[PDB]
Design a protein around this ligand. Sequence first.
Ligand SMILES: OC[C@H]1O[C@H](O[C@H]2[C@H](O)[C@@H](O)[C@@H](O[C@H]3[C@H](O)[C@@H](O)[C@@H](O[C@H]4[C@H](O)[C@@H](O)[C@@H](O[C@H]5[C@H](O)[C@@H](O)[C@@H](O)O[C@@H]5CO)O[C@@H]4CO)O[C@@H]3CO)O[C@@H]2CO)[C@H](O)[C@@H](O)[C@@H]1O
Ligand SMILES: OC[C@H]1O[C@H](O[C@H]2[C@H](O)[C@@H](O)[C@@H](O[C@H]3[C@H](O)[C@@H](O)[C@@H](O[C@H]4[C@H](O)[C@@H](O)[C@@H](O[C@H]5[C@H](O)[C@@H](O)[C@@H](O)O[C@@H]5CO)O[C@@H]4CO)O[C@@H]3CO)O[C@@H]2CO)[C@H](O)[C@@H](O)[C@@H]1O
Lengths: 366, 366
Amino acid sequence: EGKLVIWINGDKGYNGLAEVGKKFEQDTGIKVTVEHPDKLEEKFPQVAATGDGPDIIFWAHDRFGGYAQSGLLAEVTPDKAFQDKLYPFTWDAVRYNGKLIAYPIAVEALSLIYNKDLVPNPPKTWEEIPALDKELKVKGKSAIMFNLQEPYFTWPLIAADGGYAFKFENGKYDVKDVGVDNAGAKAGLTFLIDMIKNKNMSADTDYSIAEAAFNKGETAMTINGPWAWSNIDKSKVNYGVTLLPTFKGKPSKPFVGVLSAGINAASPNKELAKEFLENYLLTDQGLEAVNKDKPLGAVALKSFQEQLAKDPRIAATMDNAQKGEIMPNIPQMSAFWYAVRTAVINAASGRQTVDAALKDAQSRIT
Amino acid sequence: EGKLVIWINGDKGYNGLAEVGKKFEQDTGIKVTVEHPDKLEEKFPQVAATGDGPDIIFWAHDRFGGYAQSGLLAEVTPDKAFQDKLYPFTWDAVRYNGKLIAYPIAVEALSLIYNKDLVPNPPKTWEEIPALDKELKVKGKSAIMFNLQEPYFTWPLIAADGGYAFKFENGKYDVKDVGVDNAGAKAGLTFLIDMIKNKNMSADTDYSIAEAAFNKGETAMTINGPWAWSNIDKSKVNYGVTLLPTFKGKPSKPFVGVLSAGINAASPNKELAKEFLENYLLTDQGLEAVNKDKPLGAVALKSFQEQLAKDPRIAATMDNAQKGEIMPNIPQMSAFWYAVRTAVINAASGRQTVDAALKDAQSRIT
Ligand SMILES: OC[C@H]1O[C@H](O[C@H]2[C@H](O)[C@@H](O)[C@@H](O[C@H]3[C@H](O)[C@@H](O)[C@@H](O[C@H]4[C@H](O)[C@@H](O)[C@@H](O[C@H]5[C@H](O)[C@@H](O)[C@@H](O)O[C@@H]5CO)O[C@@H]4CO)O[C@@H]3CO)O[C@@H]2CO)[C@H](O)[C@@H](O)[C@@H]1O
Ligand SMILES: OC[C@H]1O[C@H](O[C@H]2[C@H](O)[C@@H](O)[C@@H](O[C@H]3[C@H](O)[C@@H](O)[C@@H](O[C@H]4[C@H](O)[C@@H](O)[C@@H](O[C@H]5[C@H](O)[C@@H](O)[C@@H](O)O[C@@H]5CO)O[C@@H]4CO)O[C@@H]3CO)O[C@@H]2CO)[C@H](O)[C@@H](O)[C@@H]1O
């Protein structure tokens, strides 16, 4: 304790790393010792399992999932401001079981390195290298030499025509796994129906009726999104924006929508549309103009969002958003919405029980 | 042609959008017309299918996958500099079948909106709202009113206790789908073995032998990563770094490694380790010190990577990286490497045929 021991491979810049450690000690008094043991990536699980080893281990990320599965790595805790400083795909490489288990440093790939004076135009194909070697051999030279003891160096050739390690299956929505008629869905809709039966709400309330009632001070609360705030600003009501109420102790989970602008495939103006959206709308000034009319909520444009993030209404918007879920964009989403609309309206009006309404919606969607 | 027609929903800031369109026309002469038809999200697939409709359509992203499946949307083409200006998860929301099919604008979620003067401390639970309503009703008021005709507004309550739309299955490596002994793997290893048989290479060449031969000008080419460049700089050789050769017309596919720093779970210095890695190593000055010793390649730190990106050696590194694949971090990766090492060494030395070596590796991994 009171020290840092670092392990890094002997082909990396460990002397330069030790100079970073010297600056660390000069500022903090904490000694940093950089070592480069052989087989460090095999020794680490052996010594960390006994509670020994280095404080920090450097390796390519392919070793780290095995370490994390064995409980040998601490979860790292960079805040969002620090995570923003590194490329997102590098954080992905060090994420295991949903947790960040290392700090990414550098991105490595093999390349062809060539002597400009022996091969001014290096070969573009592997197949032409034997002919080049024959000409170099009469000069006492060879075309190419690389490490054949480590599979890292031969893998690019093995993969070229179709070799691979493990196949990756992309994330996907299971369009047959729908949760509209499970017990939790029924419990929430039953509560809504119970409020209607108890005359706390009326089944015929729509957007206009609820907005007028809230903005005239006739009801204490409403549920709406950022576009509604402008009309409340103009009203007499002093309003706050906060977390949706919990149900059975669990957060309400609103669907998160990304307002998006698509370009019609039939448009003869695709270049103009790109210019307008990229260079006029998606600017601080462009979004401010729309936002001043009806608030957008949080915006996708980082520079303008940092100016909105302070507003408690935006903070509440993002707190509810985090408790909820981003909507799928799959084609089946419209079928989902049409079916759920019918279920809620039928249950709220008494044309169906909650169970029969949601069962029918589930059948329609799947 | 020569116009922009925009469709946006009637609850959004369409007058503010039209002012952005006015500025567009003032600068370009191109008229922008903003309309807010009812049912625009249903009308669009009907009119875009006939080659009509608006140039740009605004909606939440949940509608857009259906449009893109129907071929109604143009692929949008923002460059990397523009994509960097928006939050990554917003681009994810508008990606369909691997392609970006809209521009994200805003991030929306419902919140509880409350009258500060009627309910200074708004309810944290749904279950307490009936009691609040009874007290407000004696004052001629009600606790809460919101739109019950659109399922968007009731969904947060339905999802709270377990309702969901479509279940998402996270991306994953299939540890039983291994490509070490397929036809492409065998073809590439066979070519390596054929070069060895033809005496273009020697099976016993290792890292040291290849590095010495290249850096003394005895071989025209080598295959190595960025850490090797420092020793070539000091040598007499004038070297370039370029794309790996193709095989059977296809790019060589090197495995991409992210050099990573993990913190030992047994370390009593986890706070010091975080301080060192975040505030000393992962700085421009910290990475420069390591990089000056042995080059890191591309770095994860955006600010320093932008200073390296100009170097043709780094450009070539990233070109090869893009043709290749990020390594998995799964625990099975070490088994993969050990098995492939044995296969390559055995095939190159003649202790096994290419087919028998790679079949054995495949069996060992699975
Ligand atoms: O005693 C018997 C045997 O020992 C010797 O070989 C062994 C090695 O000493 C030992 O390190 C071990 O090597 C394994 C390694 O543990 C395993 O992780 C995997 O290595 C991968 C890396 O994980 C991967 O990142 C990548 O490594 C790159 C690295 O990213 C890059 O930054 C730079 O450092 O180059 C590295 C490549 O050299 O690829 C490697 C795979 O090539 O697989 C390794 C095995 O190949 O186990 C070795 C075998 O026991 C002696 O060399 C051997 O002669 C003896 O027979
Ligand atoms: O004529 C019969 C019937 O017509 C009327 O209802 C129909 C609507 O006019 C019509 O627009 C259509 O509504 C569908 C919609 O097409 C479908 O996409 C889906 O809507 C989702 C959104 O996709 C989703 O983004 C979200 O919308 C939010 C939005 O994100 C937010 O920014 C803001 O605008 O609030 C929106 C919510 O209002 O959620 C909605 C779902 O609530 O589902 C819609 C159906 O609910 O089809 C309607 C039914 O035919 C009349 O209203 C009706 O009385 C008539 O019986």
